[PDB]
Ligand binder design. Structure first.
Ligand SMILES: [K+]
Ligand SMILES: [K+]
Ligand SMILES: [K+]
Ligand SMILES: [K+]
Ligand SMILES: [Mg+2]
Ligand SMILES: [Mg+2]
Ligand SMILES: [Mg+2]
Ligand SMILES: [Mg+2]
Ligand SMILES: [Mg+2]
Ligand SMILES: [Mg+2]
Ligand SMILES: [Mg+2]
Ligand SMILES: [Mg+2]
Ligand SMILES: [Mg+2]
Ligand SMILES: [Mg+2]
Ligand SMILES: [Mg+2]
Ligand SMILES: [Mg+2]
Ligand SMILES: [Mg+2]
Ligand SMILES: [Mg+2]
Ligand SMILES: [Mg+2]
Ligand SMILES: [Mg+2]
Ligand SMILES: [Mg+2]
Ligand SMILES: [Mg+2]
Ligand SMILES: [Mg+2]
Ligand SMILES: [Mg+2]
Ligand SMILES: [Mg+2]
Ligand SMILES: [Mg+2]
Ligand SMILES: [Mg+2]
Ligand SMILES: [Mg+2]
Ligand SMILES: [Mg+2]
Ligand SMILES: [Mg+2]
Ligand SMILES: [Mg+2]
Ligand SMILES: [Mg+2]
Ligand SMILES: [Mg+2]
Ligand SMILES: [Zn+2]
Lengths: 115, 219, 305, 154, 110
RNA sequence: CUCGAUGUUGGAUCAGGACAUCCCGAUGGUGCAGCCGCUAUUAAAGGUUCGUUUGUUCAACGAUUAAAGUCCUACGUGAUCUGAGUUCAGACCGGAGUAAUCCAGGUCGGUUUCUAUCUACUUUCAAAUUCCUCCCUGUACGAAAGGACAAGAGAAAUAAGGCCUACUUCACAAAGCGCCUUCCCCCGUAAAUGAUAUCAUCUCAACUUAGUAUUAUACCCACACCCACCCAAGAACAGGGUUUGU
RNA sequence: GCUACCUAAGAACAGCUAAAAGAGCACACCCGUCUAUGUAGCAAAAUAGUGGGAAGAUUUAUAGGUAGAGGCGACAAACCUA
C-alpha cells in the first residue's frame, strides 16, 4: 500500500508531525523485504528535512475482508525503540494493531479511537 | 418478494448443482443469523466478534455503498466518517463472526453504487454512530432517497461523469461546465442499451430459487 | 467409403426410440453394480504400513469459501465423483513396473462417439464408457474387483490428497505471459520492442541451448497439486471439499489420490481400506462429514470468550 | 485467449457490428428470406429470434416499441413485426427461424447460409429430409421396437 | 535476412509435394434425389436451391408491382396463387400475389 | 585473420559458464571464555537490494540486507531495443596560427535499415531457499558487562507451479494488487580396532563408525463415430463433447 | 517552369482582445519544434499527433531578368531542374 515516495499523513499530535513545512512527509524506506508496507509495518520518513521512523496505522489500499480501509495513508511517528513521539492519536486506528501489543504497547496506549 | 442479490448467480458455465449446494449453506446460516433486507444507500449497524477488540466485540455503523459477490462469499461495504477520517469496511454476509446485522434506516438511492461518495463532500458520508433505528411500516414501498450530492473539486477517483457509470445522484451542473459534459458524451455507446443478445433474463432462475427457499423454511 | 454417424440413416421415428433405448440400458448397467459386496468381491485385507490404495476421478464443480473455528477463511474446491468405477487390474508381474496397478474411469459418455475397441472392452465389463481412465499404483493387498463403484466417502476429512489435471490452455503465448519476462520500456525511444525476449544466448556458442525459454504453447498440460487437505465430504452428492485450488477449468475431470508427501506417509491406518463400501457399511454415514476445525453452516456464531 | 467470448468481431468495431447485423435483420423482416455469409447469419440469428419476443409484448409496450424502432431501419416494417410476424408465432415459444448452409459464394468462395422466418409465403427451401421409415435399417429397428413394447406389456 | 544459398528443386519438391500441401479427397459428396445432380451432405443442392431462388425472385417482382413504391409493406399476410386457383377460406384477408404460370409441383399449396 | 565493412562506450532485455566463496552448508587452527571476529580446508544446488549527482564503467553519499562476490562469455548480447557519451557536415569560448584551419579541452545541436533461406532453439512434466519472532534463556560461558548452539513452535519474503470464492482491473471470461501448494542428499574431517614397526598409529594396510541416494516416488498410458455442429482445445492442423444432428 | 535574389503589374489574410502595434489569442494560409509510424514507404523526405508564425522583414498566382573563370546569398561554403 505504502511504498517509497508515498506521501503520508501523521495522525498523532507530535510537534514534528504537525509543524508547517514546504514539503509533505514522504516515505523513503519500508522495513519489509518486499518493500510494500501495510498496517503495522515500520517505515522511514523524510519529514521537515529529517529522517524519522513511523508506524503505519491506515492506508487506502483494500486489505483482507472485515478490515477497515481509510481515505488517507496514516502513520504515527515513533522512536527507534518503538516509543511514540506524540501523546494522543485522535484519528481512528484498526483494532488489528492490538495483536502487536508486545512491541507496540505504548503506541496503542495513546490511541483514543479504535475501528 | 425481495430475493437477496447474492442468490442470483452470475451468467456462466457453472454446473447448476454447485449453486444448489451453495444455497443450502446460505439458508442454513440464515436461520442462525437474521440477514435483513437492505439496499445500497441503507444505514446498517453490524456487530462482529473480534479477537483483539475490547470486549471481543466490535460495532460499525455506516451507509451501504456497494453490494457485490455471489454465494457464501457475498459482501457489502459500509462507509462512515469518524473524527473526520472516512473509513470503509467490506463485511462478509455469511462469515460466522458476524453476530447481528441491524438496518438502522432502510432506503434506496438514485444509484445502485455509491462509490462516488468518496469524492463527495464529507457531510454526505457522515452518520452519527448512535443514531436510533427509524421504524419501517409493514408492506410499504421501500423509500427512495433522491438526494443529489455535491462533489469536491476534480480530479476524482474515477470519471464519474462518463456514460458507462450512469450515475444520476450527482449535481453535475454545479461541478462541471457545459464543455466538460460534452467531452464526456464522446464515450457514449447508444447501441449498447438495444443489444438484445446481452440481456440476462433471471426470471426463471429466480422462480426456481424461491421454490428452494420456501422448502427450507418448512423444515 | 463415406463416413457415417449413428443417426445418419435413422428416420424421424427411430431417433427418439434409439436415444431412449440406449439411455435406459446405461442406467440399468450402472444400477446393477450398486452391490459390490454381494457379487463375489475379492479378499478385503486389513491396512498395513506401506500400503497404497486406489484413488478417484472427480469433476471440478467450482470453488466455495468456508471458515474455521479460529475465524480464518479457507477457500475450497468442490470435486464431485460422477460414476466412478474400477475398470482393470494389472498384477505386479504384468505391469512392467515396481507395483501393481488398478485402472479407474469416471463420468459416462455416449457410446456413439467411441472407438469400436473401446466399446467392446466396456461391453465385456458391463458398464457404459467413461470419458477419462487413469492408472493408480497400488499394493497387492489393495486390489479391487473390476466394476466396483467408488464414492466420495472413499476419502475422509483431515486427510491430505494430491489432485492432477490438465491446466487451462492459453494457446501460443509470448515470453512475458508464459515465463514472466519483464519486456522493455514503454517509451524513451523503444522501436517495436516492448514484449520481446531480448537476447536468447551468447555470441560465442553460436547456438541456442536446449530448453531455452521462448514463446510457445502455454498450459493444457498435466500438473499436480500436492498436500491438499480434505475439509468436508458430502455423502449424498458425493462431493469432496479440498483445500485451495486445483489445476484445470470448472467441469473438468481431476485425478484424486492420497498425498505422497513424506509428512503424510502412513496416515491411512484409519482410512477405508481397500475402499469404502456403502452397502457393506453397517451404519449409514451422515449427509456431511466435517473436519473438527470447520464451522458448520448451522453452528452458532463464533465468540472469542 | 478467447474463452467464453460468445460474440464475433466483425465490421469496423462494436458499433459497426450492430449496424451490420441490424441491416441484415431489417432485410429479413421485409423479405422473410435472405442469403449472406454463414458467420454473419449465425450471429444475427440470435437477434432475429429475440425480436419476435419483443414483438409479442405488443405495440403498446413502450420498451418493445423503442427496441423495434432501433432494430428496424425501415419504419413500414414496425407494423409488420407487431401485427404480422408476432401474431404468426403466437403459439410458439421459440424456433422462429431456420438457417441452412448453401453453396459457397462464387466470387470470394465465402461460406454462405440462407435464413428465413418459418411460415413465410415464399417457395419452400429444399429442406434436408431424414431417410424414410421404410428403409431396410428403419424396418429392422421398427421390429425391434415392436418387440420391446410387446414384452413390456406382458 | 536474405537467403544465403539457392534452394534446390529436390528440396523444393519435398516441400511442395508434402501430403499437407496436397488437396484432400472429399468423402461427403452424394447424389441429390430430387434432381440427380451432386451435392454435399451438409449443404443444400445447388441445382434445387437455384430453382427455388428463380421462383422466389419472380414472386418478389410481383410483390413489388402490388406495393408500387418504397415503405409500403403490408400489414396482412400474403398468399401466392397460381393460374387456375382461387383463394381458399384460410386465404381470406391476405394479399394475393398472382403468378402467371402453373403451380410448380415442388411448391405445395397450403 | 578481416578495410568489394568482423558496427564502436555505458544502459535495457535475457542470461550460459569458472570458483580464486560475498551470503547460506560442513570442518581444522586461533593471541577461539561467551557474543562478535581472523585464518585455512570442503562446497557453485540457491541467492546476491532500492535510491540522489554523473552519459558514464567506477567513485562518493542516503536507506537497507543473511549477502549486496570476483571473473569469462567478440571488454556476452544493436538482423531484439536504447543513442546520453564518443565520432561527420552548423555554432560559441579559451588557446595555437599571417591566414585557411587546428585542439588527448570544454559547450549546444545532430537520419540507428533489414519481409529469416539454412543451423540452433521454442513445457531439462513434478524433491525450495532464506530471514525473522517465540521458546530454549537471561540458561551454557564469564569477575562483571554481555550473551549463545542444537531441539521444538509459529510467521513471513523470494522462487517455482496453479487457480477465480471474495477483493481489485473487470464481468458468460481474462487478470493481480488476491488466493492455494511446494518433499532427498552431498565428504572437509572427527573417532575405534590393528599390522608393517609385537607400545603406539582413523588405514593410498587388511578393516569399523559418523556416512549418504541403483535420487525416491509422482505425472503421462484404452483410440477409423467423426460429414457436420459446439467447446473451458486451438494460428493452421490436432484435441474434448454431441445419449445436445430443428 | 525547381531554388536564391530582383523587376513589372495583381491577389489573400475569419473571429476575439487591445485599439497604438515587424502587439497577443486564434481559423484559412505559410512554416517545420518534438515523438511515434514509415525505411524498395502512400512518399528518391511522407503520415498522425504536437508545435512556430499568421497586417507583415508576411504568404501567394502570372510574365520577365541575373549562367558556371559565373550567378545569387539576412554566409548555412546555402541555392542555381531529386
Ligand atoms: K577492416
Ligand atoms: K547452414
Ligand atoms: K603407522
Ligand atoms: K505521399
Ligand atoms: Mg536538509
Ligand atoms: Mg485511483
Ligand atoms: Mg484455451
Ligand atoms: Mg513494462
Ligand atoms: Mg525508426
Ligand atoms: Mg512501441
Ligand atoms: Mg475484419
Ligand atoms: Mg564479403
Ligand atoms: Mg546466470
Ligand atoms: Mg573452492
Ligand atoms: Mg550461484
Ligand atoms: Mg561487447
Ligand atoms: Mg534495428
Ligand atoms: Mg548482433
Ligand atoms: Mg548524441
Ligand atoms: Mg576563438
Ligand atoms: Mg553533446
Ligand atoms: Mg532540437
Ligand atoms: Mg523478425
Ligand atoms: Mg535456537
Ligand atoms: Mg588405539
Ligand atoms: Mg598394537
Ligand atoms: Mg514592384
Ligand atoms: Mg484578422
Ligand atoms: Mg504579430
Ligand atoms: Mg502569435
Ligand atoms: Mg571553361
Ligand atoms: Mg559560418
Ligand atoms: Mg564550414
Ligand atoms: Zn437437387
Amino acid at each position: 500500500a505504502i511504498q517509497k515516495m508515498t506521501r503520508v499523513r501523521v495522525v498523532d499530535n507530535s510537534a514534528l508531525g504537525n509543524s508547517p513545512y514546504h514539503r509533505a512527509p514522504r516515505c523513503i524506506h519500508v522495513y519489509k523485504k518486499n518493500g510494500v508496507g501495510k498496517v503495522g509495518d515500520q517505515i522511514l520518513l523524510a519529514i521537515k528535512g529529517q529522517k524519522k521512523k513511523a508506524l503505519i496505522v491506515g492506508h487506502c489500499m483494500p486489505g483482507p475482508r472485515m478490515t477497515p480501509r481509510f481515505d488517507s495513508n496514516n502513520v504515527v511517528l515513533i522512536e527507534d525503540n518503538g516509543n511514540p513521539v506524540g501523546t494522543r492519536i485522535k484519528t481512528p486506528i484498526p483494532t488489528s494493531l492490538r495483536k502487536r501489543e508486545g512491541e507496540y504497547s505504548k503506541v496503542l496506549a495513546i490511541a483514543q479511537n479504535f475501528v | 418478494r425481495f430475493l437477496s442479490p447474492e442468490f442470483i448467480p452470475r451468467r456462466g458455465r457453472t454446473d447448476p448443482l454447485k449453486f444448489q449446494i451453495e444455497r443450502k449453506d446460505m439458508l442454513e446460516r440464515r436461520k442462525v443469523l437474521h440477514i435483513p433486507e437492505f439496499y445500497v444507500g441503507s444505514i446498517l449497524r453490524v456487530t462482529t466478534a473480534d479477537p483483539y477488540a475490547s470486549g471481543k466485540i466490535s460495532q460499525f455503523l455506516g451507509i451501504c455503498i456497494q453490494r457485490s459477490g455471489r454465494g457464501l462469499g457475498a459482501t457489502f461495504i459500509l462507509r462512515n466518517v469518524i473524527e473526520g477520517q472516512g473509513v470503509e469496511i467490506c463485511f462478509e454476509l455469511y462469515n460466522p463472526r458476524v453476530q447481528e446485522i441491524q438496518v438502522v434506516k432502510l432506503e434506496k438511492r438514485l444509484d445502485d453504487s455509491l462509490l462516488y461518495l468518496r469524492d463527495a463532500l464529507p457531510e454526505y458520508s457522515t452518520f452519527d454512530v448512535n443514531m436510533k433505528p427509524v421504524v419501517q411500516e409493514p408492506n410499504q414501498k421501500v423509500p427512495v432517497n433522491e438526494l443529489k450530492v455535491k462533489m469536491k473539486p476534480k480530479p476524482w477517483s474515477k470519471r464519474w461523469e462518463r456514460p458507462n457509470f450512469n450515475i444520476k445522484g450527482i449535481r453535475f451542473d454545479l461541478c462541471l461546465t457545459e464543455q466538460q459534459m460534452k467531452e464526456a458524451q464522446k464515450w457514449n455507446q447508444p447501441w449498447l442499451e438495444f443489444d438484445m443478445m446481452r440481456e440476462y433474463d433471471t426470471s426463471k432462475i429466480e422462480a426456481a430459487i424461491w421454490k428452494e427457499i420456501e422448502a427450507s423454511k418448512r423444515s | 467409403k463415406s463416413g457415417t454417424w449413428w443417426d445418419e440413416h435413422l428416420s424421424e421415428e427411430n431417433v427418439p426410440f434409439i436415444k431412449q433405448l440406449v439411455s435406459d440400458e446405461d442406467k440399468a448397467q450402472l444400477a446393477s453394480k450398486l452391490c459390490p459386496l454381494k457379487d463375489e468381491p475379492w479378499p478385503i485385507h486389513p491396512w498395513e504400513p506401506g500400503s497404497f490404495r486406489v484413488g478417484l476421478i472427480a469433476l471440478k464443480l467450482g470453488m466455495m469459501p468456508l471458515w474455521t473455528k479460529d475465524g480464518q477463511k479457507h477457500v475450497v474446491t468442490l470435486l464431485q465423483v460422477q460414476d466412478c468405477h474400477v475398470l482393470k487390474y494389472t498384477s505386479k508381474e504384468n505391469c512392467n513396473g515396481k507395483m501393481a496397478t488398478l485402472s479407474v474411469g469416471g463420468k459416462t459418455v455416449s457410446r456413439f462417439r467411441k472407438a469400436t475397441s473401446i466399446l467392446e472392452f466396456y461391453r465385456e465389463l458391463g458398464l457404459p464408457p467413461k470419458q477419462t481412465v487413469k492408472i493408480f499404483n497400488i499394493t497387492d493387498n489393495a486390489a479391487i474387483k473390476p466394476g466396483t463403484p467408488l464414492y466420495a466417502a472413499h476419502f475422509r476429512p483431515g486427510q491430505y490428497v494430491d489432485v492432477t489435471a490438465k491446466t487451462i490452455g492459453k494457446g501460443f503465448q509470448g515470453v512475458m505471459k508464459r515465463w514472466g519476462f519483464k519486456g522493455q520500456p514503454a517509451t524513451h525511444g523503444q522501436t517495436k520492442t516492448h514484449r520481446r525476449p531480448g537476447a536468447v544466448a551468447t555470441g560465442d556458442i553460436g547456438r541456442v541451448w536446449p530448453g531455452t525459454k521462448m514463446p510457445g504453447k502455454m498450459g493444457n498440460i498435466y500438473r499436480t497439486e500436492y498436500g491438499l487437505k480434505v475439509w468436508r465430504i458430502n455423502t449424498k452428492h458425493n462431493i469432496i471439499y479440498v483445500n485451495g485450488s486445483v489445476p484445470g477449468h470448472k467441469n473438468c475431470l481431476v485425478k484424486v489420490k492420497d498425498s505422497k508427501l513424506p509428512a503424510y506417509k502412513d496416515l491411512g491406518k484409519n482410512l477405508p481400506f481397500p475402499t469404502y463400501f456403502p452397502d457393506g457399511d453397517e451404519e449409514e454415514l451422515p449427509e456431511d462429514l466435517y473436519d473438527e476445525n470447520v464451522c458448520q453452516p448451522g453452528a452458532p456464531s463464533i465468540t472469542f470468550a | 485467449i478467447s474463452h467464453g467470448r460468445v460474440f464475433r468481431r466483425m465490421g469496423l468495431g462494436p458499433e459497426s457490428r450492430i449496424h451490420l447485423l441490424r441491416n441484415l435483420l431489417t432485410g429479413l423482416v421485409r423479405h422473410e428470406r435472405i442469403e449472406a455469409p454463414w458467420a454473419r447469419v449465425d450471429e444475427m440469428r440470435g437477434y432475429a429470434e429475440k425480436l419476435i419476443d419483443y414483438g409479442k409484448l405488443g405495440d403498446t409496450n413502450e420498451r418493445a416499441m423503442r427496441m423495434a424502432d432501433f432494430w428496424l431501419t425501415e419504419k413500414d416494417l414496425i407494423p409488420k413485426l407487431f401485427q404480422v410476424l408476432a401474431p404468426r408465432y403466437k403459439d410458439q415459444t421459440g424456433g422462429y427461424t431456420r438457417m441452412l448452409q448453401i453453396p459457397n459464394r462464387s466470387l470470394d468462395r465465402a461460406k454462405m447460409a440462407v435464413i428465413e422466418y418459418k411460415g413465410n409465403c415464399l417457395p419452400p427451401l429444399p429442406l434436408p429430409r431424414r431417410d424414410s421409415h421404410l428403409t431396410l435399417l428403419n424396418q429392422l429397428l421398427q421390429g425391434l421396437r415392436q418387440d420391446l413394447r410387446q414384452s413390456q406389456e406382458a | 535476412a536474405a537467403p544465403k544459398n539457392r534452394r534446390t528443386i529436390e528440396v523444393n519438391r519435398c516441400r511442395r509435394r508434402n501430403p499437407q500441401k496436397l488437396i484432400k479427397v472429399k468423402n461427403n459428396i452424394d447424389v441429390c434425389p430430387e434432381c440427380g445432380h451432386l451435392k454435399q451432405k451438409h449443404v443444400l443442392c445447388a441445382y434445387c436451391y437455384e430453382k427455388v431462388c428463380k421462383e422466389t425472385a419472380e414472386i418478389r417482382r410481383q410483390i413489388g408491382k402490388q406495393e408500387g413504391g418504397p415503405f409500403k409493406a403490408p400489414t396482412i399476410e400474403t398468399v401466392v396463387l397460381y393460374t387456375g386457383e382461387t383463394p381458399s377460406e384460410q386465404d381470406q384477408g391476405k394479399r394475393i400475389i398472382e403468378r402467371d404460370r402453373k403451380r410448380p409441383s415442388w411448391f405445395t399449396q397450403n
